[PDB]
Structures are given as structure tokens and as C-alpha cells.
Design a protein around this ligand. Structure first.
Ligand SMILES: COc1cc2ncnc(N3CC[C@@H](Oc4cnc5ccccc5n4)C3)c2cc1OC
Ligand SMILES: [Mg+2]
Ligand SMILES: [Zn+2]
Length: 305
């Protein structure tokens, strides 16, 4: 049961889940119980499911089990501050999707799997790792004693698996540019309709981006330390590009590590700032995510000065 500090701070968008792994299942149970009532799930089955999810994340620098529970926490905070917009089934699907959305990641991009000619890239030619993450989730749910949705009707099971598949695939950041461009146009023409399932699927895709990127919405010491882990994987991938005989892009080239601050400025301006600006226009109570992101941009601008 939750320590008082955590019961309080868990409600902040910039909560950090701490270094005790064994506290994370209970943090996730607490969130999904607070969002979806306690009858939502059988505690034993859900416990079994969380441990199996944990076991199928790898010990890589950034796309690991801590990233998964962090992305789930950001979704919890968005859903808690947007009471009555999403259904109980959407709330449960989206927290499950976040916990599962990088299952079995090895720390390499879809672009590297494609250049390597990995077998996953023949199986899933677009959104390769994300199609795999969703495949892993379904395989885990299919293990004995792991069907945390066994009390739903067949129709509601199929519906929640669809909420989860679309939410996982939307974490392919290649898809975010076009999604956010469509949402911005809907917002500005006043045509966005949350009753329209295609529009609602877009807003959930943007939620998934905002949660996947949320290191840039923590406080600066967290954001800066997290950036170490993000570059650790990118530089490992850049080494592997070099070994295939392909010069990596600068972000993946550890010899270009002095240009980190400039690369962060690029990212914030092209991706994170527009992402949280669009999200705040659609869901005004997400505004703290945007304010934290602007503060971090100003920190990277300070490092440059
Ligand atoms: C907080 O630091 C982060 C966090 C990430 N989380 C998840 N995926 C990331 N990437 C996926 C492929 C890449 O995608 C892209 C897409 N578009 C751009 C535009 C301008 C600069 C960089 C851009 N990168 C980079 C980053 C990248 C990053 O900073 C350099
Ligand atoms: Mg991912
Ligand atoms: Zn992720």
C-alpha cells in the first residue's frame, strides 16, 4: 500500500516513479483502480499479468520496464485531469496499452531493423516494432491465468483489444507528424468532434505521443538524466549502423555528442512543443505538460549559452 508521499505526488504530471522496481506494480494497480474502480480487475490475475509484462521488457538503457510504467503514469495523470471524457473501457485499455507499448524492445529503431534486414521487418513492414509490441501483448493475454479481460463480453474484449492495438501503433513517432497536423486543422476549423470515432482515435494517438515523450515534461534534473539513457541507446544503434557500413545520422553518432543541446532544441521545436501545444488546445487541463516542456526548452537554451 502507497506511502503518503507517493499518494500525494502521484497526482502531479511531473511525478518520477523512483528506483525501487518492486514498488512499480503496486503504483500501476493503484492507478488503474483509481481510474477504473477496484472491480475493474481480479487482483491475482492482474498481478500475474504485470509480472509477465515486466519479464518481457529487456534490460536496455531507455525502452525498458521503467519507461513503460512512466508512460502509464503520464496517461493516468491526463485521464485523472480530464474526468468524464473517456469511458471506463477506454481508460483501462489505454493504461494497459501504455504498460505494454514497448514490449520486447531491444533498443533499436524501425529504421535499423529495416537496414539490418531483420525478420520482424519482413513480417511487419511499417511500424515494425509497434506491430511486434501489440503481438507480444496479445500473446501475454493468451497465457493461462493472464486474461485480465476474461470478465468482459466477447464484443467488449474485441473492442478493448482494438483500443490497445491503435494506441500501441500510434507510439510509432513517424505517425505523429501527420496525426498532429490533422488535429491542428480540425481544432482550428472547429470541426473536431470527440463523438466521431475517427477523430477520438486521433486524440487518443496524440495522448499516446504526449505520454511516450513525457521525459521532456518532468523537472529539469529528471529530464536531463533521462536524456543520458535516450542517447545511450541511440549511440549504441549508431555503432551498429557503422558496423553495417552505413553512416548514422548525427543524433545516433556518438562522435557528434557535443551537438546534443542543438539536437534537443530541434526536437523540442519540431516535435515536443507542437505536441503539447496541440494537446493543451484539445484538453486544457494538460497545460502543466506544456509549461514543463517550455521550461525544459529554456534549460537546453541555457546549456547552449
Ligand atoms: C528528449 O529527447 C528525445 C526523445 C525521443 N523520444 C522518442 N523518440 C525520439 N526520436 C525517435 C526518432 C527521432 O525522431 C525525430 C523526429 N523529428 C525530429 C525533428 C527534429 C529533431 C529531431 C527529430 N527526431 C528521435 C526522441 C528523440 C529525442 O531527442 C533528440
Ligand atoms: Mg516504442
Ligand atoms: Zn515508449
Amino acid at each position: 500500500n502507497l506511502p503518503a508521499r507517493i499518494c500525494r505526488d502521484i497526482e502531479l504530471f511531473h511525478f518520477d516513479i523512483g528506483p525501487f522496481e518492486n514498488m512499480w506494480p503496486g503504483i500501476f494497480v493503484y492507478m488503474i483502480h483509481r481510474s477504473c474502480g477496484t472491480s475493474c480487475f481480479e487482483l491475482e490475475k492482474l498481478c500475474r499479468f504485470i509480472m509477465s509484462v515486466k519479464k518481457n521488457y529487456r534490460r536496455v538503457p531507455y525502452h525498458n520496464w521503467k519507461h513503460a510504467v512512466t508512460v502509464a503514469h503520464c496517461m493516468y495523470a491526463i485521464l485523472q485531469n480530464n474526468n468524464g471524457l473517456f469511458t471506463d473501457l477506454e481508460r483501462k485499455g489505454l493504461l494497459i496499452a501504455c504498460l505494454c507499448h514497448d514490449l520486447d524492445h531491444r533498443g533499436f529503431s524501425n529504421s535499423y531493423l529495416q537496414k539490418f534486414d531483420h525478420p520482424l521487418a519482413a513480417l511487419y513492414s511499417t511500424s515494425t516494432m509497434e506491430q511486434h509490441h501489440f503481438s507480444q501483448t496479445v500473446s501475454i493475454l493468451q497465457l493461462e491465468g493472464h486474461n485480465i479481460f476474461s470478465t468482459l463480453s466477447s464484443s467488449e474484449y474485441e473492442q478493448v483489444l482494438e483500443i490497445i492495438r491503435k494506441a500501441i501503433i500510434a507510439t510509432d513517432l513517424a505517425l505523429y507528424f501527420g496525426n498532429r497536423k490533422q488535429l491542428e486543422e480540425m481544432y482550428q476549423t472547429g470541426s473536431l468532434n470527440l463523438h466521431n470515432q475517427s477523430h477520438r482515435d486521433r486524440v487518443i494517438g496524440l495522448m499516446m505521443t504526449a505520454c511516450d515523450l513525457c521525459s521532456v515534461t518532468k523537472l529539469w534534473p529528471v529530464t536531463k538524466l533521462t536524456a543520458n539513457d535516450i542517447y545511450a541507446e541511440f549511440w549504441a544503434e549508431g555503432d551498429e549502423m557503422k558496423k553495417l557500413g552505413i553512416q548514422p545520422i548525427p543524433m545516433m553518432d556518438r562522435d557528434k555528442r557535443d551537438e546534443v543541446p542543438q539536437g534537443q532544441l530541434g526536437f523540442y521545436n519540431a516535435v515536443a512543443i507542437p505536441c503539447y501545444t496541440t494537446l493543451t488546445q484539445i484538453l486544457p487541463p494538460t497545460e502543466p505538460l506544456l509549461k514543463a516542456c517550455r521550461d525544459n526548452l529554456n534549460q537546453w537554451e541555457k546549456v547552449i549559452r
